[PDB]
């Protein structure tokens, strides 16, 4: 039984070295330490100092050098007794503060234990090297085991989700976070491989190519949906939910992908040093001479949509080699060579559209002097250039019953062209997903286990509308986690008959969510929509209105002291300041019907599907004319949340250890920022308000019997013995609660009992 | 080294309030005997004063860690009576009775909580012994019915430990093969390597019989041997215990018995004290080297 055999790879790579005699009697004294910040500006960089003095409301310790400081006991981050080093769940720590959480992750990472639970979360730190814990032999160990029967592992989360799906006949979701480099793509692959292995029905037919197809969808979706931003070279700018589907007997039957919230604005504008979506650079770098000739291609410097940010390449990334991978993936998921060329023609056409330069003609009317870009776009799109030219500068509308051409000026023509580009790109993205699903989903499912990953909580020096949307999505998903943790905690306290009550943790997020999307009183999105109706509004009247409705009236909002154009929102991950510039423009999403009429007549098979398929195209309207971008956003998010609320969720948090791609180098500043952005610290905050440590009575007595007079180590009535120890030590009863089978302790109290044990043993 | 027994005396004091832990194993001597063996008389003759509770049946209802320390002066102290010096041994007996009743609900049951009594006296050698409840069948007392098992279970907690030397006390005027002390010592120490035998009441044996074969270590062999004693109680003018006369009477007994004269120098209370002091000291010397590290791992 490898789970008990200290010589197995299960023990070598998934358990703490302790074994039995090793980590258990390695001395210990009576000295206590504290975690502190050597430089107050870097709040996530710590060192360990020795406590020296001790007073009423403060401690006194010597910095790692010898200098001295003091800290209000109310703010001190004490270090846990050595017995707590390496625990498999952060909830087992007694001092539950940020540096202590990092320390435990580090004790484990330094022994190559990359998986650690933190309450409901499975935290997975990229080791930046291969560890042999994904073999068939490891799969067999996890098969059918409960989370508390085995060490932390992505296979444990996967198995529990699979058994719950079968036992409860309920779909499951696995919400996984992590920026590129965190190991999220690899962990998601392990989930899929694990499910294919335990739910495989491979005898006779083999396992086919479904797994391979699901994995190959990645390079395609990343090429069109990921981009370099100032904080990550490969940032996902969309959300995706990959359903691994099963038949009624529990065997894998197929998969499906659904995308959400793609950032279409990036196609037409990118901030300094960022890039447009990777596919544009891949195509220009890897197309063959003949493909460049037929698509009228040139270098990225030659296109307005790729030459404004100052950055066209990524250090260490070959866009040409990445294009090769993208095409190979397209072959595997079934795109014909002709469909692939049509996809590239549309990407080329978007670039040519971006190069059209509208000029003021004789009067205000826009005109096109040089028809080069127009003609190149028309050729690759398979449309009539005269029709496209008129649809761009003289789109017709109905004035009463009369068809009238609105002759646009330069600004409106440029804007319409951009709107056409964003529509083409978004529809193309939906068509790619639909085409991939043509091969992934060929049987009606009975159930599914879906993996969700979306853009992570984002903070830049200057944050705009796109960032508020991304962060609002993250806020809603964190409330979803909080609510589920609440339901699970309610059941644990009730099962133990613990005398402590609490309300739905999801309510802690309501103030921020209401600030953003409330309707009554109206939140930010509602006031942005209100300000998008009349021409009297400006970005300045918009922020004045936000300050008027929320400054000093909503605790989660801040009118900054020294900026007239930013407003602050306190999210679970901290405060984010948002710049209002251009929000009114960004909320408008109209597309001229004459442009759709133009493209509906394309001679290209894929272009016609983007404009004739009522699903990919159109949507509806609003009994009016068009839904704002904020209303579209809110609706896609609501659709995603409704899907999640039908499932039983599981949460995985993948972490980058450092930003140098170096193994064995866990950095606190880098790790703590991610734990803050991914909700782990929010889970810890909640955990600290209750009773995190829960100890079976007999185990408490076995360890602490010596701290009280005449209490047998193996006392027959473990509850009375536990009470005798607590009463003799004069523990404040508010710091613990007796349960039917375990004693519950508030943060810090068990560490103090452990410290008393260490002291008593050294005395003896 | 005159320092080993005192060192373990401090450890016993420190563990006196630490409840049972099967892994904690200090080098010490546990006194085991059937209720009829006269084990109280053996201890009172070391001290030279009557100081143990008197009553029918059980005399020790809580383990008594009795630390004897040779001294020029004579007085006693209980660990639970900080700073008090007892010079009247009748008060010592009364305090053992009071402290015992204080803990035991029923006035006849037992408790594992020890009473830690140290006696300084010119009549003793440096020696420590843990007296335990004597064994008996018929619960004849007043609660509980399973008393025999409760006593045996408490005795086993002590003597199943490897560092516990066993002082097995048996009366000569009985069937020594059926000795409760020697039988329980054989259950836990089959090779008879950590059991010291004491044969009491030698002067009470039937006319024409003697315990020579057991005293010579031939009939019921024990590596650490057997020592015979007799309680020939002498009272002084006031009617109180006269140890010098009692020890002289015991000496006269062994010198004049034709079956024991040749062993007299290895019989009697003074010799038994000498033997226990020597064997306990050597045992501590043996076990001390690995002690500190072991304790850390067992606490």
């Amino acid at each position: 039984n490898p789970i008990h055999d200290r010589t197995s790879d299960y023990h070598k790579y998934l358990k703490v070295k302790q074994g039995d005699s090793d980590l258990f009697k390695l001395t210990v004294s009576d000295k206590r330490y504290i975690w502190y910040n050597p430089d107050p500006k870097e709040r996530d960089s710590y060192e360990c100092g020795e406590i020296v003095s001790e007073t009423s409301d403060s401690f006194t310790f010597k910095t790692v050098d010898g200098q001295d400081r003091q800290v209000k006991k109310d703010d001190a981050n004490q270090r846990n007794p050595i017995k707590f080093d390496g625990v498999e769940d952060m909830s087992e720590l007694s001092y539950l503060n940020e540096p202590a959480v990092f320390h435990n992750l580090r004790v484990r990472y330094n022994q190559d234990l990359i998986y650690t639970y933190s309450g409901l979360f499975l935290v997975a730190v990229n080791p930046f090297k291969r560890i042999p814990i994904y073999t068939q032999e490891m799969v067999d160990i996890f098969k059918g085991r409960r989370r508390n029967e085995v060490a932390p592992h992505i296979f444990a989360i996967s198995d529990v989700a699979y058994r719950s799906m079968l036992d409860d006949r309920q779909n499951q979701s696995l919400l996984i976070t992590g920026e590129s480099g965190a190991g999220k793509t690899e962990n998601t692959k392990k989930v899929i491989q694990y499910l294919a292995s335990v739910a495989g029905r491979n005898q006779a037919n083999g396992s086919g190519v479904l797994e391979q197809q699901i994995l190959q969808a990645n390079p395609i979706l990343e090429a069109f949906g990921n981009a370099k931003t100032t904080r990550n070279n490969n940032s996902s700018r969309f959300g995706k939910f990959i359903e691994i589907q099963f038949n009624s007997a529990g065997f894998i039957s197929g998969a499906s992908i659904q995308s959400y919230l793609l950032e279409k604005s990036r196609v037409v504008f990118q901030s300094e040093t960022e890039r447009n979506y990777h596919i544009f650079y891949q195509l220009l770098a890897g197309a063959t001479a003949e493909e460049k000739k037929a698509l009228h291609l040139a270098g990225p410097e030659s296109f307005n949509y790729l030459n404004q940010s100052g950055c066209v390449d990524i250090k260490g990334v070959s866009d040409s080699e990445e294009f090769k991978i993208t095409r190979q993936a397209m072959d595997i998921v079934g795109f014909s060579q002709e469909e692939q060329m049509s996809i590239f023609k549309i990407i080329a056409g978007i670039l040519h559209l971006g190069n059209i330069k509208f000029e003021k003609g004789a009067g205000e009317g826009a005109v096109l002097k040089d028809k080069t870009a127009l003609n190149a776009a028309s050729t690759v799109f398979g449309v009539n250039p005269s029709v496209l030219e008129k649809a761009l500068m003289e789109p017709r509308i109905l004035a009463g019953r009369d068809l009238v051409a609105q002759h646009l000026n330069v600004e409106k023509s440029s804007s319409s062209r951009d709107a056409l580009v964003k529509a083409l790109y978004g529809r193309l993205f939906l068509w790619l997903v639909k085409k991939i699903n043509n091969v992934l989903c060929q049987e009606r499912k009975a159930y599914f286990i879906g993996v969700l990953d979306i853009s992570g909580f984002e903070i830049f020096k200057v944050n705009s509308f796109e960032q508020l949307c991304i962060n609002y999505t993250n806020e809603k998903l964190q409330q979803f986690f909080n609510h589920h943790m609440f339901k699970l905690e309610q059941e644990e306290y009730l099962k133990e008959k613990i005398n402590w009550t609490f309300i739905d943790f999801g309510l802690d997020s309501q103030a921020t969510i209401d600030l953003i999307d409330g309707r009554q009183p109206p939140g930010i999105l509602a006031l942005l929509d209100e300000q998008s109706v009349f021409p009297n509004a400006t970005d300045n009247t918009l922020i004045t209105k936000l300050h008027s409705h929320f400054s000093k009236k909503n605790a989660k909002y801040e009118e900054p002291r020294f900026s007239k154009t930013e407003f602050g929102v306190t999210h679970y991950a901290g405060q984010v300041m948002y710049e209002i510039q251009d929000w009114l423009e960004k909320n408008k999403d109209p597309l001229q019907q004459d442009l759709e009429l133009c493209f509906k007549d394309s001679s290209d098979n894929v272009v016609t599907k983007l404009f004739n398929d009522p699903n990919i195209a159109s949507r509806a309207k609003k009994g009016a004319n068009f839904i704002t971008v904020a209303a579209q956003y809110k609706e896609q998010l609501a659709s995603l949340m409704a899907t999640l609320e039908t499932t039983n969720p599981h949460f995985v948090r993948c972490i980058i250890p450092n930003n140098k791609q170096l193994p064995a180098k866990l950095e606190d500043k880098v790790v703590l920022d991610q734990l803050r952005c991914n909700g782990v610290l929010e889970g810890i905050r909640i955990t600290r308000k209750g009773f995190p440590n829960r100890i079976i009575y007999a185990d408490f007595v076995k360890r602490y019997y010596l701290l009280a007079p005449n209490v047998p180590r193996d006392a027959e009535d473990s509850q009375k013995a536990t009470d005798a120890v607590l009463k003799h030590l004069n523990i404040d009863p508010e710091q613990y609660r007796f349960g039917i089978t375990k004693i519950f302790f508030r943060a810090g109290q068990l560490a103090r009992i452990e410290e008393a044990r260490e002291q008593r043993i050294s005395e003896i | 080294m005159e320092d080993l027994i005192p060192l373990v005396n401090r450890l016993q004091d420190a563990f006196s309030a630490i409840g049972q832990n099967a892994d904690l194993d200090l080098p010490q001597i546990a006194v085991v005997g059937g209720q009829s063996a006269g084990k109280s008389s053996v201890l009172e003759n070391f001290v030279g004063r009557d100081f143990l509770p008197r009553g029918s049946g059980i005399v020790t209802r809580r383990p008594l860690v009795l630390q004897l320390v040779n001294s020029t002066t004579e007085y006693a102290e209980f660990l639970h009576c900080k700073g008090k010096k007892f010079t009247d041994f009748e008060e010592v007996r009364l305090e053992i009775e009071a402290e015992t009743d204080r803990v035991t609900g029923t006035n006849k049951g037992i408790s594992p909580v020890p009473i830690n009594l140290r006696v300084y006296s010119p009549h003793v050698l440096n020696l420590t012994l843990v007296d335990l409840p004597g064994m008996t069948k018929v619960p004849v007392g007043d609660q509980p019915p399973d008393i025999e098992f409760q006593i045996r279970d408490m005795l086993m907690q002590f003597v199943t430990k490897e560092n516990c030397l066993i002082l097995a006390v048996s009366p000569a005027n009985s069937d020594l093969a059926n000795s409760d002390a020697l039988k329980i010592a054989k259950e836990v120490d089959p090779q008879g390597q950590r059991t010291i035998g004491v044969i009491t009441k030698l002067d009470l044996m039937d006319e024409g019989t003697d315990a020579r074969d057991v005293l010579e270590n031939k009939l019921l062999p024990l590596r650490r041997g057997y020592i015979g004693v007799v309680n020939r109680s002498q009272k002084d003018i006031d009617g109180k215990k006269d140890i010098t006369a009692a020890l002289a009477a015991e000496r006269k007994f062994f010198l004049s018995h034709p079956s024991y004269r040749h062993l007299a120098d290895r019989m009697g209370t003074p010799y038994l004290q000498k033997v226990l002091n020597q064997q306990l000291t050597n045992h501590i010397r043996d076990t001390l080297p690995g002690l500190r590290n072991k304790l850390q791992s067992q606490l």
Binding site: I761, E763 | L7, R10, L11, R292, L295
Partner: peptide, 6 residues
């Protein structure tokens, strides 16, 4: 433990 000389 400190009661026991090492």
């Amino acid at each position: 433990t400190r009661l026991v000389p090492r």
